Design a protein around this ligand. Structure first.
Ligand SMILES: CC(C)CN(C[C@@H](O)[C@@H](Cc1ccccc1)NC(=O)O[C@H]1CO[C@H]2OCC[C@H]21)S(=O)(=O)c1ccc(N)cc1
Ligand SMILES: CC(C)CN(C[C@@H](O)[C@H](Cc1ccccc1)NC(=O)O[C@H]1CO[C@H]2OCC[C@H]21)S(=O)(=O)c1ccc(N)cc1
Lengths: 99, 99
């Protein structure tokens, strides 16, 4: 698709059997969601934002569908105020910013 | 242009007559710039992101050139670690996400 930005660019995502949605965020290096069901063991990691730094749970090799495109990569679980798809996965679905 | 997302999508901006650079951020509702002087009366606001809230000054109807394209709109000024162009100005230059 070609998505305009008059509202937040939210898309469906699917991980395992869970359908969620998330914000396509070109300002995010990393993908972060609030919860992922039965994800297994994780590794601690720190991530920084506008307000300071947060501890997250890092899961690698996650298979995720984004807007009907398959991606595989690192998904962080942490106290983000909204699920975000960051550039580590946006590149895999071939998203670009255009103007 | 078409911007791929293998690195942060930073572009040149011009604001207050000064050349700066800023992140094109589809995940940001509003534009936030580091400390600088702007014209007009401002209003106090708070903005929330990862890791918490920050206090900003809101200035309205500010001209900003974004990679050669003129935009006019709301600009928040405050202790962000990076200049961010949010959707409020991305929409004025017709920026879209494509995949
Ligand atoms: C964009 C910033 C300037 C915002 N200011 C916030 C303020 O806490 C900081 C913002 C600040 C601080 C330093 C450098 C840049 C910005 N301090 C400041 O302006 O200086 C005063 C604080 O102690 C002293 O330092 C010099 C005189 C005093 S503010 O206009 O007073 C304001 C306060 C509350 C909200 N919600 C929104 C804005
Ligand atoms: C978290 C999003 C819902 C909102 N944020 C925009 C987002 O693009 C920020 C924009 C950003 C970018 C750099 C530093 C601070 C904020 N990126 C971010 O927090 O990414 C974090 C996860 O990946 C990491 O890569 C960047 C830091 C990590 S935000 O900066 O807090 C913000 C919130 C409201 C407005 N008006 C403007 C910006």
């Amino acid at each position: 698709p070609q998505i305009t930005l008059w509202k937040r660019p939210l898309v469906t995502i699917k991980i395992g059997g869970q359908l969620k949605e998330a914000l396509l965020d070109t300002g995010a290096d990393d993908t972060i969601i609030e919860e992922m069901s039965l994800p297994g063991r994780w590794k601690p990691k720190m991530v920084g934002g506008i307000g300071g730094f947060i501890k997250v749970r890092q899961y690698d090799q996650i298979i995720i569908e984004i807007a009907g495109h398959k991606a595989i990569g690192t998904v962080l679980v942490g106290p983000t105020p909204i699920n975000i798809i960051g550039r580590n996965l946006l590149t895999q679905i071939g998203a670009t910013l255009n103007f």
